[PDB]
Nucleic acid binder design. Structure first.
Ligand SMILES: [K+]
Ligand SMILES: [K+]
Ligand SMILES: [K+]
Ligand SMILES: [K+]
Ligand SMILES: [K+]
Ligand SMILES: [K+]
Ligand SMILES: [K+]
Ligand SMILES: [Mg+2]
Ligand SMILES: [Mg+2]
Ligand SMILES: [Mg+2]
Ligand SMILES: [Mg+2]
Ligand SMILES: [Mg+2]
Ligand SMILES: [Mg+2]
Ligand SMILES: [Mg+2]
Length: 88
RNA sequence: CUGGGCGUUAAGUUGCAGGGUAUAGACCCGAAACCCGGUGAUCUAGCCAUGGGCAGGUUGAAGGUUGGGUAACACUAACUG
């Protein structure tokens, strides 16, 4: 659902460089962008269970990446959740 | 018609008094009712407009705020109401 330009902007904003697409912060930011974007789609299409499964997969993947980041480096995790506006 | 029915050989009429009858309230008193035209919503029934009344003490719906909760809901606790 994210466009190429938006994906590249997120990668540049959260990674070490434009090639840092694999960092945990970049992945979590991309997942957050997709989840927030789909919120509008599921507000209108409440019975789109099949697509909602893919959304819930993004949510669980973000949770697992966040727990890994918190286990590894607490400061990076705190900065990332503050920047993204996530409760945890 | 041999006949048979009704008649012919018995004074009426007009007043006055009286007895009966008729039409009328017709010996007097007495219904429940029926019809016609009026008077009544100062009681009461409903409605309409315009004003008033309801000491004192309780219970604690929805809603709201904050926290928890959720990807977002949902949900949950306290306070408020
Ligand atoms: K005769
Ligand atoms: K006479
Ligand atoms: K008489
Ligand atoms: K009659
Ligand atoms: K009246
Ligand atoms: K009262
Ligand atoms: K309440
Ligand atoms: Mg993907
Ligand atoms: Mg006489
Ligand atoms: Mg007489
Ligand atoms: Mg009759
Ligand atoms: Mg009157
Ligand atoms: Mg009143
Ligand atoms: Mg009172």
């Amino acid at each position: 659902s994210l466009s190429t330009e938006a994906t590249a902007k997120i990668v540049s904003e959260f990674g070490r460089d434009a090639n840092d697409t694999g960092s945990t912060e970049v992945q979590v930011a991309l997942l957050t962008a997709q989840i927030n974007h789909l919120q509008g789609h599921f507000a209108e299409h409440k019975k789109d269970h099949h697509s909602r499964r893919g959304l819930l997969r993004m949510v669980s993947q973000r949770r697992k990446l966040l727990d890994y980041l918190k286990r590894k480096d607490v400061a990076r995790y705190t900065q990332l959740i503050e920047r993204l506006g996530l409760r945890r």
